[PDB]
Each structure stands twice: as structure tokens, then as C-alpha cells.
């Protein structure tokens, strides 16, 4: 069980850790988060009380280093940093644990929600979508645009998701125009899975990362990416059975975790109605269809 200590909390802020969140008051004696489960990526995220504009946060994996949080009063945000001195970190963390200045990652033993949302998400792939190689952790915020959004403006601060475009030469074989547009299996299986992602695990990892950035930061281009990756599978007539079954589980837990009050803005009616009721896979997503119909019957 690892720990992300905080030097202090000088400004009032709502702090998220994965699907949990808590309020910290201005100069409240808060010194971090303990008991973080090893084996998963995590995200620690922030919304200042005085400016709800800009949710921002950091993806990290405690197996890759000792990470801490310190407020920067010049840039005006909580920054993640890596502490290189292992013995300084062990002594200070312990001191804080002794003074009970840390919140505990509050995982219910029965609860697989975070595993289910991050099953295929790996830090190494996050760091290729979010390029800042001098750090082992990755910063994301509400405003960052994707590579595809920028084609339609600072490249260093972009989300390099895999570009998916259904009306593109990449998606459409010359001479198979109608076939490839109405059945996207060759784009899914040959171009994307065999060619770009190499396997379905990497595809699902990017899909799950896009959803989590949409949900936690309201990142609009991430939501576009999540829906495009769903629609590419649903619009393919030929999808391996294990991928369909896994997608159903992935989407089920995403829909289950979504705040009911953000459904209106995080869910694209056209994609979901198409995917559940018109597409080749309209009858392949039983768990997702059942939770969508019971939780969000308005959208449909």
C-alpha cells in the first residue's frame, strides 16, 4: 500500500483520488493520501474552490517512483513531483502517518470498480498519449485538446489519442467504399487492431483512458475519442467474441460509475442509440443495454 504525501494545502480545493473525492479547507492540516492499492494506475485530481474552471490532475503508478504533491503559488496549482531520495520520503511519510495527517484510500473490500475501469490501462501507454518524458506521471486537464481536434494549437500540451475518422482513406479501401463504410470490420481488425494497437488489450486501454479523462476532467476531446472507439467496434460486423464480451463489461462499469447528473453532457445520444439498437452489435451488449435502459432511458 503506497502513499502520495502533500507538503501542505494552502488553497481550498476538492481533491479526487480515482472515483473518490474530499474537500480540503484553506490551510487545513492535510498531508496526503495513504493505503493506495498497488497494481493499478491511479489519478489524483483537483478542483479549486475559488475557480471551478480547470479540473486538472495526474495519472501515476506508485510502482514507478515515490510521488508527492506541493502547491506552487506562482503557477497556482497543486503539482506532482518525484522525490529521488528514498530515505527522506520514508522518514517524512512515516512522520505524517504517525500524526494521522493523511486520508486513507477508502476501498471497500468487495469493490472491484477501479480495477474494472482501469483493467487494460497501463502507465506506459498513458505516457505515449500524454507526452512529457522527463516525468513518470502524466498531467491532464479539462482544456487539453487532442491531436485530431487540432487538425480540424500547442502540440506539446495535446492528447495524442489514436486518430479515428470513418470518412478517411485510412478507413476506406479503394474499391471497397460502400463495403468498408457500412461494415467497418477491416478498419477495426486490420488497420487498427493488427496495425496500430497490435492487440485488443491496448485498444481497450486507450478506450478506458479516454472515458476516465472525459469523466474526471470533463475533457471534451476525450469523450469524442471514447465514443469513436465504441462506435468503431459496434459498426463492425466481424468482431472476435472475446472482444464483444469484454466491451460489454467495460461499458457496463463505465455507465455504472458515471454521475447521473452528468449523463446529459457525457453521453452522445446518436452513438448510443446506434450502438444498442441499429448496429451489427445491437444484440451483443446485454449488460450495457440493461444498465443504460434502467439508468438513462431518457437518452434512448
Amino acid at each position: 500500500m503506497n502513499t502520495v504525501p502533500f507538503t501542505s494545502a494552502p488553497i481550498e480545493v476538492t481533491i479526487g483520488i480515482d472515483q473518490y473525492s474530499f474537500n480540503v479547507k484553506e490551510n487545513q492540516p492535510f498531508h496526503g493520501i495513504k493505503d493506495i492499492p498497488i497494481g493499478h494506475v491511479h489519478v489524483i485530481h483537483f478542483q479549486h474552490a475559488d475557480n471551478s474552471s480547470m479540473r486538472y490532475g495526474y495519472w501515476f503508478d506508485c510502482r514507478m517512483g515515490n510521488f508527492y504533491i506541493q502547491y506552487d503559488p506562482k503557477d497556482g496549482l497543486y503539482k506532482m513531483m518525484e522525490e529521488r531520495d528514498g530515505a527522506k520520503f520514508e522518514n517524512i511519510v512515516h512522520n505524517f502517518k504517525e500524526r494521522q495527517m493523511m486520508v486513507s484510500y477508502p476501498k471497500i473490500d468487495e469493490d472491484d470498480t477501479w480495477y474494472n475501469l482501469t483493467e487494460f490501462v497501463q502507465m506506459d501507454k498513458i505516457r505515449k498519449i500524454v507526452r512529457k518524458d522527463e516525468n513518470q506521471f502524466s498531467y491532464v486537464d479539462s482544456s487539453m485538446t487532442t491531436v485530431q481536434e487540432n487538425e480540424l494549437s500547442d502540440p506539446a500540451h495535446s492528447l495524442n489519442y489514436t486518430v479515428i475518422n470513418f470518412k478517411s482513406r485510412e478507413a476506406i479501401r479503394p474499391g471497397h467504399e460502400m463495403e468498408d463504410f457500412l461494415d467497418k470490420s477491416y478498419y477495426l481488425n486490420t488497420v487498427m487492431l493488427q496495425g496500430i494497437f497490435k492487440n485488443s488489450s491496448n485498444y481497450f486501454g486507450e478506450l478506458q483512458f479516454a472515458f476516465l479523462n472525459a469523466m474526471f476532467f470533463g475533457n471534451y476531446g476525450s469523450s469524442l475519442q471514447w465514443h469513436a472507439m465504441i462506435e468503431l467496434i459496434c459498426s463492425s460486423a466481424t468482431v472476435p467474441k472475446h472482444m464483444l464480451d469484454k466491451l460489454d463489461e467495460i461499458l457496463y462499469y463505465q455507465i455504472k460509475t458515471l454521475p447521473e447528473q452528468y449523463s446529459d453532457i457525457l453521453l452522445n445520444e446518436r452513438v448510443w442509440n446506434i450502438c444498442l439498437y441499429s448496429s451489427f452489435q445491437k444484440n451483443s451488449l446485454h449488460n450495457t443495454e440493461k444498465i443504460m435502459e434502467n439508468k438513462y432511458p431518457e437518452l434512448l
Binding site: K167, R169, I172, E177, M178
Partner: protein
């Protein structure tokens, strides 16, 4: 974006453009079977591809053999249309290729866009105009060449005959759309108006009769009356 009444003069500027109308590509007769079920029998169709500035008509005849053994023919017909328009563009020299293609039905947008991916600089546009190009098969010589085709074929007519020697392309298009609107609303009456006077003939190399300027005014008046009448007979006014 969409072509409508507000940007209507754009049709007659010097940027090459084509209208594409697919309403006569897939044509059927519906009939009863011996068992008393219903079935369709396809007849020859055509793509109506028209340069409104010059009067060029690229009439691609769609022979019924293209439908043999195919399913979802109304969907296929849109993609076949887009395939043939793309092939036409590729066949044309660069300086003759259109800068825009305006489809008369919005369902042609995605098929045409996908077939034209190789031409990113050619804009594919819808229109809000309700154009009467479906009535092209009421022009006797066009109907005749379509029905007589025994194989796929492209035929090239000027739909304005020689009118551009005397009038502008705006006026020629207005005349064409009036004639076609009339043929669409009451074909028998429209053809009666056009052919009633035996002394006015259709030249062998033309589609419409050889009216004088004054006779065209009379003809155009009679066509407006027809359209207004039928609009009367229809709604009872």
C-alpha cells in the same frame, strides 16, 4: 454549405460545378405474382449529372443487369451513383473537373463524399432547392435512350439546346426548371403545350422544340399557368 435561394447566382459563376440527381437510378414496376404476392421488376435507370452553367448533361445509363443478385437495391443505388460520378470526374482532364458537386438529395452526401476521398478539394454540397430533375425521364429523347440501352452507357447531350446563343445561363436554367416542374406536375398537359403546334419541330440534335424568342414567352406563360392550375386542382383553390 447548403445551396438555397440566397446563394442562387453562384450556379452561374465561372467555378465548374455539377448537380447530381439520383432519383431515376433505381426504377421498378411493382406487380402481383402468380401466388398473389407482390414483387418488383427493375427497368433501366440513369444518373442525371448536369453543369448548370453550360447545359452539359452527363447521362449515365444504369442497365438493369447492375442489380442482378444484389440486395438492398435502394441503398446500393446511392453508392453506385457515387461510384459512377467519381469515375466521371476521374475521366475528365484536371481543368474540366468540378470544384463543387451539389446533390439534389441529402442521402447522396456520405456515399459521394466517401467515393471522392481522393479529391479533398472538391466540395460535396446539399441543396435546399426542390429541383425537378426527376422529370428528366419525361424528355422523350432521354427516356428513349435509357429504355433502349442493352448495356451500361454514358450519353452526352446539352440540355439547353442552343439557348445560350441568345440567353444567359441564369435564364436558361430558369427555363429548364420551369419546363421540368411542369412536366412533373402534369406531364400530359405539359407535352401538349410543347408539341401542340405542328410547325414547330425539334431538331435532330436537340431535345426541345425550336421556338422563337416570342414563342418561348408564350410557352413559358402556358407552363406557369399549368403549374398554378394543377396547384389549384390539387388543393382546391
Amino acid at each position: 454549405g447548403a445551396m438555397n435561394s440566397s446563394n442562387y447566382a453562384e450556379l452561374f459563376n465561372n467555378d465548374i460545378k455539377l448537380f447530381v440527381d439520383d432519383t431515376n437510378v433505381y426504377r421498378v414496376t411493382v406487380h402481383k405474382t402468380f401466388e398473389g404476392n407482390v414483387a418488383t421488376k427493375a427497368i433501366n435507370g440513369c444518373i442525371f449529372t448536369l453543369n448548370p452553367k453550360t447545359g452539359h448533361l452527363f447521362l449515365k445509363i444504369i442497365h438493369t443487369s447492375v442489380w442482378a443478385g444484389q440486395k438492398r437495391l435502394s441503398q446500393l443505388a446511392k453508392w453506385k451513383t457515387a461510384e459512377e460520378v467519381s469515375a466521371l470526374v476521374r475521366s475528365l482532364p484536371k481543368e474540366e473537373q468540378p470544384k463543387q458537386i451539389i446533390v439534389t438529395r441529402k442521402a447522396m452526401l456520405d456515399p459521394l463524399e466517401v467515393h471522392m476521398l481522393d479529391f479533398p478539394n472538391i466540395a460535396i454540397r446539399p441543396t435546399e432547392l426542390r429541383l425537378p430533375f426527376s422529370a428528366a425521364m419525361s424528355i422523350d429523347k432521354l427516356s428513349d435512350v435509357v429504355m433502349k440501352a442493352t448495356e451500361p452507357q454514358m450519353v452526352l447531350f446539352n440540355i439547353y439546346d442552343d439557348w445560350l446563343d441568345r440567353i444567359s445561363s441564369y435564364t436558361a436554367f430558369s427555363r429548364l426548371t420551369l419546363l421540368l416542374r411542369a412536366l412533373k406536375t402534369n406531364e400530359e398537359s405539359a407535352k401538349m403545350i410543347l408539341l401542340s403546334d405542328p410547325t414547330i419541330t425539334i431538331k435532330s440534335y436537340h431535345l426541345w422544340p425550336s421556338f422563337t424568342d416570342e414563342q418561348w414567352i408564350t410557352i413559358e406563360s402556358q407552363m406557369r399557368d399549368l403549374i398554378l392550375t394543377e396547384y389549384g386542382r390539387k388543393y382546391n383553390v
